[PDB]
Amino acid sequence: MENFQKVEKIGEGTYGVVYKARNKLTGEVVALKKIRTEGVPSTAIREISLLKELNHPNIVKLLDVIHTENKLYLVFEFLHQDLKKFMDASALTGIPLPLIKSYLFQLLQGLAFCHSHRVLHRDLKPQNLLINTEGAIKLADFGLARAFGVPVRTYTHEVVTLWYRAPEILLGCKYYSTAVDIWSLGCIFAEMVTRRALFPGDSEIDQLFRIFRTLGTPDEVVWPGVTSMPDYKPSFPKWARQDFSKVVPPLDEDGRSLLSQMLHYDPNKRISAKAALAHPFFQDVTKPVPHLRL
């Protein structure tokens, strides 16, 4: 490219292909994301550009928004490995508890920061949580969903993971809140602990029913207004809530209580990132260094 040198394709992102690139004039290595047509919405460019101002140790920095030759690219700081790969790599022994606790703590800090700045992510998943050799973890892509109009599927004819989608989204609610990110993070927390996805749905209804079979089919008592959600159906099977100690064994009671507050059905009852940072679970949090194979 005119201003970069491709090092390799890193993967397929929500909004387009992502490459590990080298800046032609600086020599710096970055994550270059090509945004997948109409004419590159102007509202999106202005809105995304505002995100360049976000700076926090737990948020992947957006270095630039490049609009040239009528194509759009997002330039991000390049991190060492993603949480999906790290979890896969730690499958045999599992991620040590102190490291799980540290990552969760840092992710909540990133969420608290973004949410305090009126920015939501809406699509948190292991793939956009990036780690480095020093023990930090950062969230990438905050604010892109609101700015863009997340297409049903990628122009790559691939597949979109639904595993971390909040129930209000699955029920067709078109108004998002900070709670959708707490739900996703809760799902990720459970996955780090058990070494298996909490709700690995293969479709939206399967995703929804997997949640119902574990936490119980929601009703007006635990979630006022649920029966009026866009895609709610009175014909949904009525599953009883499962013993929560069966959900994420063998995590201790502080971890289980915090997780239960991150997974409340009613977005309004779901714990905020700020309040979660004060939960007793983090009383002994530290910052361990991960064993990363690059």
Ligand X SMILES: C=CCNc1nc(N)c(C(=O)c2cccc([N+](=O)[O-])c2)s1
Q: Which residues bind ligand X (CB under 6 A)?
A: 10-13, 18, 31, 60, 76, 78-79, 81-82, 127-128, 130, 140
Among residues 88, 123, 219, 266, the one annotated as catalytic is 123
Give catalytic status of residue 181 as yes or no.
no
Least distance (Å) between residue 108 CB and ligand X: 19
> Residues at the annotated binding site for Mg(2+)?
128, 141
Chain gaps in the chain, named by the residue before each (C–N > 2.5 Å): 36
**Contact yes or no for 37/45 (Cβ under 8 A):** no
Least distance (Å) between residue 172 CB and ligand X: 26
| Closest residue by Cα to residue 69 from 21, 3, 12, 122 | 3
Torsion of CA 275, 14, 176, 72, to 10 degrees: 110
**Contact yes or no for 266/222 (Cβ under 8 A):** yes
Q: Which residue in the shown chain puts its C-beta closest to ligand X?
A: 11
What string of H, E and C letters represents the secondary structure of 21-89? Answer: EEECCCCCEEEEEEECCCCCCHHHHHHHHHHHHCCCCCECCEEEEEEECCEEEEEEECCCEEHHHHHHH
Least distance (Å) between residue 163 CB and ligand X: 15
Spatial separation of the C-alpha atoms in residues 163 and 181, rounded to whole Å? 13
> Residues at the annotated binding site?
10-18, 33, 77-79, 82, 125-128, 141
Spatial separation of the C-alpha atoms in residues 22 and 3, rounded to whole Å? 9
Paired residues of 21 in beta bridges: 6, 30
Least distance (Å) between residue 92 CB and ligand X: 21
Q: Is the CB of 60 or the CB of 108 nearer to ligand X? A: 60
Q: Is the CB of 160 or the CB of 285 nearer to ligand X? A: 160
> Residues at the annotated binding site for ATP?
10-18, 33, 77-79, 82, 125-128, 141
Determine the longest span between alpha carbons in the chain, in angstroms. 61
**Contact yes or no for 199/187 (Cβ under 8 A):** yes
Q: Is the CB of 60 or the CB of 169 nearer to ligand X? A: 60
Least distance (Å) between residue 176 CB and ligand X: 19
Q: Is the CB of 7 or the CB of 222 nearer to ligand X? A: 7
Q: Is the CB of 30 or the CB of 259 nearer to ligand X? A: 30
The SS3 call for residue 138 is strand
Which residues belong to the active site? 123
